[PDB]
Amino acid sequence: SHSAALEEITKLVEKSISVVEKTRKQMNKRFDEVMK
Amino acid sequence: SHSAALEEITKLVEKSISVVEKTRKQMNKRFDEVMK
């Protein structure tokens, strides 16, 4: 039960990391756009 | 205590993800404000 929950939480943390990565990529592209 | 904490970590992670989505949506709208 612990292993299933911790692994499930681990997937959620990986999803959060991935959405943070695409978020920073998008806002960096937007920063390039606003500087342009 | 663990299962209460296990869902506590899960709910905190999912609410953090929701806050991240709200933040990115609002800042994209506000960058659109910036360009206009």
Of A16, A19, A32, A6, the closest CA to residue B31 belongs to A32
Interface subset of A 17-36, CB within 8 angstroms of B: 19-20, 23, 26-27, 30, 33-34
Instruction: Please tell me what resolution, in angstroms, this structure has.
Output: 3.2
* A14 reaches B (C-beta below 8 A): no
Experimental method: cryo-EM
Rounded alpha-carbon distances, angstroms, from residue A34 to A18, B11, B22, B24, B33: 24, 36, 21, 16, 11
Helix/strand/coil percent split, chain A, to 5: 95, 0, 5
Q: Do B17 and A20 touch (CB under 8 A)?
A: no
Q: Do A26 and B28 touch (CB under 8 A)?
A: yes
